[PDB]
Amino acid sequence: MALYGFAQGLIQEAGIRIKQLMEQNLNDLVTNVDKATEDFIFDTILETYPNHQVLGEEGHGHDIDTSKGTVWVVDPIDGTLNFVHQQENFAISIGIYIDGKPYAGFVYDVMADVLYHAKVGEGAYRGSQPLKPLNDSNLRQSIIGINPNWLTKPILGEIFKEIVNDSRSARAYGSAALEIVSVATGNLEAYMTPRLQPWDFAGGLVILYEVNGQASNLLGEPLTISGPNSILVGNRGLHQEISNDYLEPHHDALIQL
Amino acid sequence: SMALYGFAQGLIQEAGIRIKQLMEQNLTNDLVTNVDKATEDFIFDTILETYPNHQVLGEEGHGHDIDTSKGTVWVVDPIDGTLNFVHQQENFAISIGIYIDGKPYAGFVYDVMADVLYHAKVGEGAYRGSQPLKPLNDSNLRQSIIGINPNWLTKPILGEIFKEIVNDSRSARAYGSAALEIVSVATGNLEAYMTPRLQPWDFAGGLVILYEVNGQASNLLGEPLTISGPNSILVGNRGLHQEISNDYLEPHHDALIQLHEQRFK
Amino acid sequence: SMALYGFAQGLIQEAGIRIKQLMEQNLNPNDLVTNVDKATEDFIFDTILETYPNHQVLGEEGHGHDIDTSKGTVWVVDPIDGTLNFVHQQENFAISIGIYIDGKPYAGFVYDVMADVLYHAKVGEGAYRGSQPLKPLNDSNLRQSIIGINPNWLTKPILGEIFKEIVNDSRSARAYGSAALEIVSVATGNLEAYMTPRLQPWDFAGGLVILYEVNGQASNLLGEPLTISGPNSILVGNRGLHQEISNDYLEPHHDALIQL
Amino acid sequence: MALYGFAQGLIQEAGIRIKQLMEQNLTPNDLVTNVDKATEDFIFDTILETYPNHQVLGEEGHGHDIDTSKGTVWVVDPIDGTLNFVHQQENFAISIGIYIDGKPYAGFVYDVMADVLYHAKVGEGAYRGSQPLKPLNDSNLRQSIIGINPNWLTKPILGEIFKEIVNDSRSARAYGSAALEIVSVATGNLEAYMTPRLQPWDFAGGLVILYEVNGQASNLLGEPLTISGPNSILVGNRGLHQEISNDYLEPHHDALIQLHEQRFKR
């Protein structure tokens, strides 16, 4: 219980620190702020909990057997390009796991000052408001998040062609944690990418699970924090439609990758 | 001088509250149809009253066959981004452009849920609320972020042209309200935005805002946008605009013209 | 029907941008405010008159001092309510506009120029802070109420004694230097009441409509209705404490008060 | 400068916790009460956890009995403006002043709902967010706007003294957060501010800021304000501070001494 309180406090403080850094005005910046903020999160975690492991975008973590003890998986800036170009629409993602099992997840939209957070088996929240469980949708009646940049790619362009076609429309926001959360809130019916690192899904994942969401990789396998993977989330009915209807006919090509 | 601009400004704002009343009421997707219709009727009726001499070109079936070149013309989309409205209950905008004698005069795009109004008058600056907007600077495609629905890279002939540009861009986004995507360029939030098909009521408001920040608009053939009919759209900071149109679009002028004639009539 | 309401809303926002434009271009503090005030009224007045040449304008700066205010559409405007604030703080001042049709309230607007916040309502249609509806007021006891009243009124012959009780008794007091915003403070629930012995139509006309929409109550200090006929005293609050201040704090000074 | 940033970060984090607690309640003088306790406890615990040899003097009872001239002392008010918090849900401020060996060092007051942080380190100027504040110019009382709660004008003897100066001034305002009001003097929004009673937690932050833009502060008897006790307050730009003190207050020295003793002895 104190763990959760400590982490929320941390992520908020991480927030203040990023906004402080964005002056500055009084591309090198993004990577500095990324390094500075991860050092801060990693340093604060060890200062109260030196038995915990931090798996970080900035090169903290390191073969960490992610199955043992308490593990923080953090991206102080999920949405690097948004940050450089829009100065907004990025998030700190933190997911906390214990004994290889998810415990809490936070994704915090720094500039909008919205924190999405969830504890396992206790519901998902936008600030103080509960998120409602997702309902099944039909793909044709569904909005999917997917970056236009993935359709340009050699193979893969072909494998996503159908799913973009039948879906109702498509969006792309450029921060994987927030898109994952967007599904949790029902603002997208599905989101997918061929490659994501665990620090960009660990937070989002736990939140989605609380609203009855559904996570896999493009081949239907479970997602774990042991490595990068492809992404297909969520909403039972429609995850089931995308995978195996549009996806298992490309089972072969996916596996080269 | 400012009377009409002032009037449009307050009208769109009121239209915003009413849309939110209608959403708030619903609990007490036929909803989107009804709210679209109710919003346009409100907007239409209110113009009719102060300005019986104007014409309304509307998304919802007002002004179907009118001559946009004659007199003053409000070109309105009560809900630009219907899909976002149904699914996300946000990220949609009332869009209004006003033209006189065929030429741009004033634009408004109102992000209803943010309560944020972007607006401009020709020659007079663009605005976010009452904050002036600030002119754009050139960006290179290679260091640019561009709005373009994924769907379009899926189409015959068009899809291939679009992915040279996507390939080459720094990355791509898509938000689902043309009018907001245009403002995003107006804003520096996006460096360019493209689509092969948009209606006048969807670029008319945003276009005036974009031009006031020294931005640039054209169809995919590089021809000026007018309200006389639907079109393709390229908007961006100047050149970047030049770059897309000139290295990526122009070498397919003939194919794109074919596409343009196959689409419009 | 919202046509005129819309026109007013846009106009007040536009008048606001012009105010800030005049302020930013100082590339004398009393001269600035006097210029801005004139130019600003002129600007509202011109714009009303070219869509509505039959409407009348009652302005702080001297438009319509000759008029019957109870005939047709009458706009009652103060381009800078809070002039001292404008000079001394460059903020906390409002454009106030109230519209009347045939002597009855129609729409009110107060626009806090520097905060970019516009309070507005049309009779029967609710009050709003931007796009946000204001909640209806609840009654409060005076002992638990914060009231707005300038300290200056306490220093004055006859006046000091008549307000003494009301300030001793209420929970605490505030003063902001703009009657139109203070009336809006009562409508938003930031103050429970506000009072002043003297004020012009252009300063309460906007606020009054906003406040009437949240079910507040306005009179002069003698409990008489408030018109745009001319200057009057003001007491505004939620119903209950307006009833409390009027009845057992203000009526015992009925005599007196009546000057003038 | 590490202690300065630490304090800057902490005060802001404190604001997040207050807003968070406010937001929850939308799902009760008891609100202000719990929030006051919670925020001070957060502030206090965070200070001691990094600097255990420091001391905290606090509105909520931390450090009752403290030699404020010894070592590093934080003087904090989590909600300056409890009435405004209860009634307006805004116009309140966290106030932190930091002193080392009884000398001022740093002052923070943070308008939580406006997200505007007023700060100053000693000898480094005052700031509203990241904009520097200009030194104050002298003004006459006649061309001045002073801050003063209407309630003081009705107090036996004090009323008559204050009436003289309100009457004479251009006009009066009253905002109901002394910390914010002191800062209003620092930004030139009010030429002057006065009140017969304040606690150190409410002026300690303000004073540093005021001091950086050249204002001066004293109590109603012209004595200097320290953090060792509550006091009455007069702050303003130099000129009219001298004018109000020497012309309107001073001729009632004896009356004011009596009031001061009645209120603050022993």
Residues of chain A contacting residue B188, judged by C-beta atoms under 8 Å apart: 85-86
The residue of A82, A171, A188, A195 whose CB has the most chain B CBs within 10 angstroms, and thus the best one to mutate to test that interface, is: A171
Q: Is the peptide bond before C243 cis (omega within 30 degrees of 0)?
A: no
Among the listed residues B68, B217, B71, B188, the one whose alpha carbon sits nearest the alpha carbon of residue B118: B188
DSSP secondary structure string for all residues of B143-195: G-EEE--GGGGGSTTHHHHHHHHHHHSSEEEB-S-HHHHHHHHHHTS-SEEEE
Q: How many CB atoms lie within 10 A of CB D131?
A: 9
Nearest to D23 among A13, A23, A127 (CB): A127
Q: What are phi and psi of D220, to 5 degrees?
A: -70, -15
CA distance C111 to C89: 17
Going from the C-alpha of C105 to that of each of C11, C132, C242, the distances in angstroms are: 19, 21, 20
CA distance A72 to B216: 46
Given a contact cutoff of 8 angstroms between Cβ atoms, the answer to whether C82 and D145 are in contact is no
Q: Amino acid identity, residue D25?
A: N
Full strand arrangement of the beta sheet holding A229-233: A169-171, A143-145, A190-196, A229-233, A215-216
The residue of A169, A181, A189 whose CB has the most chain B CBs within 10 angstroms, and thus the best one to mutate to test that interface, is: A169
CA nearest to A9 within chain D? D13
Q: What are phi and psi of A209, to 5 degrees?
A: -55, -40
**H helix and E strand count, chain B:** 8, 12
For B27-118, where are the alpha helices, taking DSSP H only? Answer: 30-50, 82-87
Going from the C-alpha of D153 to that of each of C73, C152, D163, D184, the distances in angstroms are: 43, 9, 6, 21
Given a contact cutoff of 8 angstroms between Cβ atoms, the answer to whether C167 and C173 are in contact is yes
Nearest to B171 among A149, A187, A188 (CB): A149
Nearest to C154 among D153, D175, D191 (CB): D153
- The answer to whether B240 contacts chain A (CB < 8 Å) is no
Element (H, E) at D231: strand D231-236
3-class state of residue A62 by DSSP: coil
Going from the C-alpha of D105 to that of each of D8, D68, D73, D212, the distances in angstroms are: 13, 13, 10, 11
Per DSSP, B265 falls in state: -
Structure tokens at B45: 């009726």
Residues of chain C contacting residue D151, judged by C-beta atoms under 8 Å apart: 167-168, 172-173
- The answer to whether A60 contacts chain D (CB < 8 Å) is no
Nearest to B150 among A146, A174, A189 (CB): A146
The residue of A113, A142, A151, A166 whose CB has the most chain B CBs within 10 angstroms, and thus the best one to mutate to test that interface, is: A151
Given a contact cutoff of 8 angstroms between Cβ atoms, the answer to whether D141 and D236 are in contact is no
Nearest to A172 among B88, B167, B172 (CB): B172
The most distant pair of C-alpha atoms in chain B lies apart, rounded to whole Å, by 57
Task: Verify A-D touch: 3 or more CB pairs within 8 A.
Answer: yes
∠ CA A83-A88-A92, rounded to 5°:
75
Residues of chain B contacting residue A148, judged by C-beta atoms under 8 Å apart: 148-150, 153, 166, 172-174
Going from the C-alpha of D110 to that of each of A10, C117, C124, D79, the distances in angstroms are: 20, 22, 40, 10
Q: Amino acid identity, residue D95?
A: S
CA distance B161 to B247: 11
CA distance B176 to B84: 7
* 8 Å CB contact of D13 and A12: yes
Pairing state of beta strands B93-100 and A124-126?
unpaired
Nearest to D13 among A13, A26, A128 (CB): A13
- The answer to whether D137 contacts chain C (CB < 8 Å) is no
CA-derived radius of gyration, chain C: 18
∠ CA D169-D171-D172, rounded to 5°:
110
CA nearest to A160 within chain B? B154
Nearest to B174 among A81, A157, A170 (CB): A170
CA-derived radius of gyration, chain D: 18
* 8 Å CB contact of C168 and D191: no
Bridge partners (DSSP) listed for residue D97: D75, D107
CA nearest to B166 within chain A? A149
Structure tokens at D136: 């104050």
CA nearest to C126 within chain B? B17
How many residues are given for chain C? 260
* Start-to-end Cα distance in chain D: 38
Residues of chain B contacting residue C2, judged by C-beta atoms under 8 Å apart: 11, 14, 42, 46
Task: Verify B-C touch: 3 or more CB pairs within 8 A.
Answer: yes
Q: 3-state DSSP helix/strand/coil percent for chain B, to nearest 5? A: 45, 25, 30
Q: How many CB atoms lie within 10 A of CB B223?
A: 11
Report the b/e string of C116-140 with b at 16+ CB within 10 A. eebbbbbbeebbbbbbebbeebeeb
Given a contact cutoff of 8 angstroms between Cβ atoms, the answer to whether A78 and A96 are in contact is no
CA nearest to B177 within chain A? A171
Taking each helix axis from N to C end, the angle separating A176-185 and A198-210, rounded to the nearest 10 degrees, works out to 10
Bridge partners (DSSP) listed for residue A98: A70, A101
DSSP secondary structure string for all residues of A221-239: PPP-TTS-EEEEE--HHHH
Q: How many CB atoms lie within 10 A of CB C35?
A: 11
CA distance D153 to C167: 9
3-class state of residue D224 by DSSP: coil
* 8 Å CB contact of B7 and C131: no
Going from the C-alpha of D182 to that of each of D137, D191, D195, D201, D213, the distances in angstroms are: 16, 10, 11, 13, 12
Q: How far is C211 from chain D (nearest CA, A)?
A: 16
CA distance B255 to B252: 5
CA distance D34 to D63: 19
List chains touching A (3+ CB pairs under 8 A).
Answer: B, D
D244-247 contact pairs (CB < 8 A, 24+): D244/D141, D244/D146, D244/D165, D244/D192, D244/D194, D245/D218, D247/D141
- The answer to whether D17 contacts chain C (CB < 8 Å) is no
- The answer to whether C66 contacts chain B (CB < 8 Å) is no
Q: What are phi and psi of B118, to 5 degrees?
A: -95, 135
The data reach a resolution, in angstroms, of 2.6
CB < 8 Å from D in window 88-127 of A:
127
* 8 Å CB contact of C152 and D166: yes
CA distance C117 to D76: 32
Place of tokens 């990355």: B171
Nearest to D150 among C167, C171, C190 (CB): C167
CA distance A141 to A166: 9
Going from the C-alpha of C202 to that of each of A93, B183, C126, C178, C226, the distances in angstroms are: 53, 38, 21, 12, 12
Bridge partners (DSSP) listed for residue B192: B146, B236
Given a contact cutoff of 8 angstroms between Cβ atoms, the answer to whether D31 and D86 are in contact is yes
Technique that determined the structure: X-ray
Bridge partners (DSSP) listed for residue B95: B77, B109
Full strand arrangement of the beta sheet holding C172-174: C172-174, C146-148, C193-199, C232-237, C217-219
CA distance C155 to D163: 5
Specify burial of residue D265 (Cβ count, 10 A radius: 0-12, 13-18, 19+).
exposed
Given a contact cutoff of 8 angstroms between Cβ atoms, the answer to whether B9 and C118 are in contact is no
CA distance B241 to A39: 40
Q: What are phi and psi of B125, to 5 degrees?
A: 95, 150
CA nearest to B160 within chain A? A152
Residues with their C more than 2.5 Å from the N of the next written residue in chain C, i.e. before a break, are 27
Domains of chain D: 1-133 (3.30.540.10), 134-266 (3.40.190.80)
DSSP secondary structure string for all residues of A136-168: ---GGG-EEE--GGGSSSTTTHHHHHHHHHHSS
Bridge partners (DSSP) listed for residue A143: A169
* 8 Å CB contact of D174 and C171: no
* 8 Å CB contact of A128 and D12: no
Residue B30's contacts (CB-CB under 8 Å, 6 or more residues apart) are none
Q: How many CB atoms lie within 10 A of CB C27?
A: 3
- The answer to whether C130 contacts chain B (CB < 8 Å) is yes
Among the listed residues D198, D228, D12, D232, the one whose alpha carbon sits nearest the alpha carbon of residue D99: D228
* 8 Å CB contact of B172 and A189: no
* 8 Å CB contact of C173 and D172: no
Residues of chain D contacting residue C155, judged by C-beta atoms under 8 Å apart: 153, 163, 166-167
Going from the C-alpha of A169 to that of each of A44, A140, A188, the distances in angstroms are: 42, 8, 10
- The answer to whether C176 contacts chain D (CB < 8 Å) is yes
Residue B51's contacts (CB-CB under 8 Å, 6 or more residues apart) are B4, B7, B72
Given a contact cutoff of 8 angstroms between Cβ atoms, the answer to whether C172 and D83 are in contact is yes
Chain-centroid distance of CA A67 in Å reads 19
* 8 Å CB contact of D149 and C151: yes
The residue of B5, B7, B18 whose CB has the most chain C CBs within 10 angstroms, and thus the best one to mutate to test that interface, is: B7
Q: How far is C147 from chain D (nearest CA, A)?
A: 10
Given a contact cutoff of 8 angstroms between Cβ atoms, the answer to whether C40 and C19 are in contact is yes
Q: How far is B205 from chain C (nearest CA, A)?
A: 16
The residue of B87, B141, B161 whose CB has the most chain A CBs within 10 angstroms, and thus the best one to mutate to test that interface, is: B87
CA distance D162 to D164: 5
* 8 Å CB contact of B11 and C13: no
3-class state of residue B139 by DSSP: coil
CA distance D126 to D107: 9
- The answer to whether B255 contacts chain A (CB < 8 Å) is no
- The answer to whether C11 contacts chain D (CB < 8 Å) is no
Structure tokens at C104: 């009855």
- The answer to whether A47 contacts chain D (CB < 8 Å) is no
Given a contact cutoff of 8 angstroms between Cβ atoms, the answer to whether D65 and D46 are in contact is no
Structure tokens at C49: 């008159």
Per DSSP, B252 falls in state: G
In three state form, how does the secondary structure of A8-58 look?
HHHHHHHHHHHHHHCCCCCCHHHHHHHHHHHHHHHHHHHHHCCCCEEEECC
- How many interchain CB pairs under 8 A, C with D? 76
3-class state of residue C192 by DSSP: coil
Element (H, E) at C84: helix C83-89
Given a contact cutoff of 8 angstroms between Cβ atoms, the answer to whether A230 and A153 are in contact is no
Q: How far is A8 from chain B (nearest CA, A)?
A: 26
DSSP secondary structure string for all residues of A67-134: TSSEEEEEEEEE-HHHHHHHS-S-EEEEEEEETTEEEEEEEEETTTTEEEEEETTS-EEETTEEPPPP
* 8 Å CB contact of D173 and C176: yes
CA distance C100 to C8: 12
Q: Amino acid identity, residue A223?
A: L
Among the listed residues A102, A78, A99, the one whose alpha carbon sits nearest the alpha carbon of residue A182: A78
